[PDB]
Amino acid sequence: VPLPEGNQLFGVVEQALGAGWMDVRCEDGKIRRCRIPGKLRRRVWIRVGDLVIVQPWPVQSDKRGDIVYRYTQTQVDWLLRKGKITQEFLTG
RNA sequence: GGUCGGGUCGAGCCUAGGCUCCGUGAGGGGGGAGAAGUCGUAACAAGGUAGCCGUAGGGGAACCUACGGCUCGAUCACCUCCU
Ligand SMILES: [Mg+2]
Ligand SMILES: [Mg+2]
Ligand SMILES: [Mg+2]
């Protein structure tokens, strides 16, 4: 339900790299090696192909970022119906 | 005191060669942490082919095989040597 606020933007998980590292495709047509904060790492399980919010790192904000929130099925369905995001971004 | 001649000592400077230090450096090599990637299961019980040492060959990877050695090897039957 919460939306990106600032430099944050959506993203689609592509492949997990191990040791809490994911490979997320963002809305600006860039692939980023993203790091999962440990606070939500322990309680929220993330799997390839999900809509998430990613904030790029302050330095070298082109290939690194942090994942802050995961969108459930109802939230992504509501977003698709509202029209803030399209279907081809999710499906690739 | 000037000028010239002779003998000797000499900091510095130039060239060549030989050693050595500092900065960058394409490319390559292992080491150490991390643990929400991956393929197997080598070790500990007889760990499911006992494990390990030396040498040599082979294999995605732990590993496998041959010759000589050690017990830091389990179970059953028989034998030997003691207290
Ligand atoms: Mg084994
Ligand atoms: Mg074995
Ligand atoms: Mg062979």
Q: A6 Cβ partners below 8 Å, 6+ apart?
A: A55
Q: How far is the CA of A24 from the C1' of B61 (A)?
A: 31
Output A19-23 pairs: Cβ under 8 A, ≥24 positions apart: A22/A46, A22/A67
Q: Which nucleotides of B are covered by protein (CB under 7 A)?
A: 34-38
Amino acid sitting at position A74: T
Determine the structural domain holding residue A72 and report its residue range: 1-92
Q: How far is the CA of A26 from the C1' of B14 (A)?
A: 68
- The reported resolution of this PDB entry, expressed in Å, is 2.7
Total domains in chain A come to: 1
| Strand B contact at CB of residue A14, distance < 7 A | no
How many angstroms does the Cα of residue A6 sit away from the middle of ligand 2? 60
CA dihedral A77, A10, A26, A13 (to 10 degrees): -60
Amino acid sitting at position A16: A
How many angstroms does the Cα of residue A58 sit away from the middle of ligand 3? 56
Identify the burial level of A51 via C-beta atoms within 10 angstroms of its C-beta, where 0-12 means exposed, 13-18 middle and 19 or more buried: buried
